[model samples]
Target: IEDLDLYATSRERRFRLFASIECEGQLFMTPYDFILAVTTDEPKVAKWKSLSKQELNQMLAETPPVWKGSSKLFRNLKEKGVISYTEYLFLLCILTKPHAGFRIAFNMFDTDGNEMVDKKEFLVLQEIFRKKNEKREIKGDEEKRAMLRLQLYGYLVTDTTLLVHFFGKKGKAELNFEDFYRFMDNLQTEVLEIEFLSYSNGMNTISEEDFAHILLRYTNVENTSVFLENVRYSIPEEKGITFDEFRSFFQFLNNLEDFAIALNMYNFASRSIGQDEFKRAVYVATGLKFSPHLVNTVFKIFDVDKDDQLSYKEFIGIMKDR
Candidate 1:
């Protein structure tokens, strides 16, 4: 179990380095480092690069206040100029798994059927999960750690300032599902754009393989090396997936259940989903006609058995979880 992809120390090592900023002992990002991490052009590495202080100000002034200014907690972040490792991880988790993360968090907090959750109540529930995390990690329950990581979004949402992003000014503020949903939607787009730019390397688009690699960055999909190898050899050189296509694919994934049902209905008519059949199912689920290059890249990544058909069950399982 420890050797399972879930327990991969490579991931932790990567995350550790990614989260590390100015000092080896520092487990947090200063405001300057945080801006640098998001805006850096270097792939898979964070450095100041070409980011400007004006850009940093623009980020802090965002409507939902991406960096600071939502509540006292964020105000402190601005004043102290530090965001801890967990705070930084919260941003990545929300960006990487917003669909599952937002829904689970909203539903859990909104317990009174009023479509809103009180800050006081949410803090109480938040403490419960935090305590649970400490206990599970101490006992070193590997599988439980995986489950907790999936649910970390809920625990991390406990931060008062992050809630204030949805809840409005601190006093008696209540979080509504609609507001939180809107923020998550925009947040994913914002972060994804930066991630895309990082991979694009100043190009208008990213290579199909890079798109595959970017999407899989925060995932636990096994045999990624094999899939990446397949993509490199199969795709013609210079074939790129545009940012619009990449964004649309994630939107398509947000309607995954519809896609699954489309596949089910198609399987009723035909036993296997070849690339063309899979593309047809996607069109059936979403009215969008995703580019052939985009579809083929996804097929390459998820068609793990070396068969010429899509293993959508595996695909959907990974998509739903991460």
Candidate 2:
């Protein structure tokens, strides 16, 4: 952790260190490089997972059938060619965190029943975001919403590609939520693949502790080192978590509102929520029963007092951020 500055590395520093590729003076990443670097450790973690030159060629050469039907701009990597580090981070920010914010902003533009909004409608969103951040008191949801608004406005102005692609040749094209949602779905899958592949071994599973570390990545927790140490010490089995379970947990993240409401109701009745209560809340919210072992790992990490009780308020806010 000290060497890589795992906890200490700010968002900007992380992208520059892990994703940027230097050529002459300018720094950018090719689509192929982005795929490879994000999937492998590059220089972090342990020894590099080996993929030969021929295998890489074959991987790039063969396009999936879905590609033929895909319309999203980022999917056509060859045409896009290169991506700046800022652009990459912009994707991670808008796509991964508080997805509800983006949806809300989109609906603000879609005021009509067409389920589509033009550039003019989009401009309203830009102005609203611009003004919201300008109010800047830095407290409560205003501060949180301000962060999203500021980042969105900055990226919208600085990068024209995303807008240009969505709006199209004459710049009069309309965008629907369905198309935007597809891009969101695609990026989430790509990011999950990158994260999972980074930690998994030849056996195709990541250690339980490593899984905890990845979950910690999205949190605003001030003292992750303690939780990480606790995970290393407390997890009972070393069988590790499979990729499917990791994916399922993320799928469950889609129901944050349901989970939040469930937690809120539970909290209204009791001061603190225990392990079973938390598990019951999860099942009630999503109708999905997570493994006992996974729930235990969650309790072990988020339980501030080590009493098998969690502060749902803190956990929800932290998870809601991403």
Candidate 3:
């Protein structure tokens, strides 16, 4: 029973994370409440805590310490007033789902498979979708199918010529895996460059203070204060936030404040910061419009310590607040 309870708690935590990242708008569960909901067996919570700590430390050791990217994408999108992070993630989710029946649905596209995605794979996946649409045999709604395809392919393939240049052969040929992967890798690099450019282009390179400020803006006073208080309490009791705990907390806070905003940010940063290339690729295939601001805000939040990258400590700390 105790073990079952602990498993339930863990499952709940996972569900909340999935729901938080996948859905828009506020979530019904608080982080603590989420845990409680899952922890049917209170006794196993102690064991769960012990294992979670070890895994957290291991994860922290494996990640990069900083973030670097160009701001071209951010700047271009922002100028066009198309910066809705939620919308971006929503679109991302649509593109990334393995709804098409691929064995490596999550893995191949997720490149890194850290369970997040980057832009290159994302765009390439879009190209794949285009190819698939061209190849697909529709029995009805041919005009409607074409319109849907156009709508579906429009977002990522904004510049068809660019797509051709990237995915096409010397002349005009469909993309193969190597071509697709190369295109994705290059696209990821380009997007990262855009992120870097965005930071250098002014916007006051994000700092801890900036992160805290963003949190304050995104969160209500009462919730923010409560989160801070919880962090203070947890540190002494738990020594520090574990990686899983941090992820759970971050997802929780993101969900609580605004699931839509959090999900968009998660999807964008997942590709850029989380480095979940495959997931990002899958998401891009979905054809949805996300809020750039929400995406940027989440990016800013996770990129604490002004390094432009998320460290284990920083990741855990942010989650702790939630």
Candidate 4:
């Protein structure tokens, strides 16, 4: 239940989302939430295409530390302009969040917000889950806590959570937001793994054009045709490169994932990205036009230090950890 794929946290819910819209002769979700409503101060379909300074902070404050590792929550939070039931579930399940969900989810638990939740906090998380399912049906707080002591075993140590924990000192320390960002980079590498493969006809191979795109798109490496031609001449098989080959290729890219994103998306600052360039980069990365909420989400997430603009470290740090 805890270790779902990067995107399909809930197979059922993720499936339903893809079916959210049907386009011309193919399956696809709506470009924007035209039919459904979203969460914003805006009354109508007027939605957010980027993050304002305040919105990103609120969302960050609302997020539970443990929840960051939850693929379910990561994708849901990736959702911009407006947001869903599961989204609300994770959002309201934690105490600090702002949600219009049932009041019981929020009020039942209270305390200092920690990026890594302690046992006491997990008790509250379980209670929030119970109340959401039960619709205000209160149970014995004593029995519930007693019951949860054992149940906590199941909820503890999720994948990225456990991963971060192990990486932390002697498995005793909690993974901070930066650590979580590193986990995100690992997950996004999975995404890029497939993304790069997609350029090929199949997941295991890459076409000449695919090689060209992967090599030339992100860098100033000129004479792309000659480089690709040399690559083709070198390979024994005339087809494309394999995942093994792709693996080595990424290693050659200065071993930084965000480097690709930074170069490919824009070169606004030469030192950092500007607001508009940031929005443009978000569109390039997500394959969706800037929705205010979503774009702002990107802005805040990348600008991890809450500064006006993203510095070189911030820029690379955000993407490297993606």
User: Which number leads on lDDT?
Assistant: 2
RMSD values for the candidates in order, in angstroms, are 8.7, 9.6, 21.8, 19.6
TM-scores for all predictions: 0.60, 0.60, 0.25, 0.29
Q: After superposition, how far is residue 76 of candidate 3 from its true place, in Å?
A: 11
The sequence of per-residue lDDT tens digits that candidate 1 reaches over residues 1-322 is 2233354344333343443332222233544344445455333643422223343333333324433332133323442243444455555555655365698878776767787777665565545544654544356666655543432322223233354444444436676676666656765676557667778898888988887777665356677787678778766675788988888787776667778788875456645578887777788887767888777778776776767676645476576454
Off by over 4 Å in 1: 1-93, 96-104, 133-160, 163-170, 215-226, 254-258, 265-270, 286-289, 300-308, 311-322
Residues 1-322 of candidate 3: C-alpha lDDT, one tens digit per residue: 2322232234333433322111112122212322222222242333212113233234223221112112222222221111122223323333222223223443566665555444465466555645764535547556544543433333322322222233332323333444434433333344333333333345334332323433454343445655454333322332222223222322334333233333455555553344242124223533322233333334444453454444433442334322
Rank candidates by lDDT, best first: 2, 1, 4, 3
Q: Which pairs clash (backbone N, Cα, C closer than 3 Å) in model 2? A: none
Candidate number with the higher lDDT (3 or 4): 4
Q: How many steric clashes does model 2 contain?
A: 0
Worst 10 residues of 1 by lDDT: 151-160
Clashing pairs in 1: none
Please provide, for model 2 over 243-319, each residue's C-alpha lDDT reduced to its tens digit, 9 standing for 90 to 100.
77787677667667778887786567766777787778888887778877667767766776677778755467677
Error of 1 at 86 (Å): 6.7
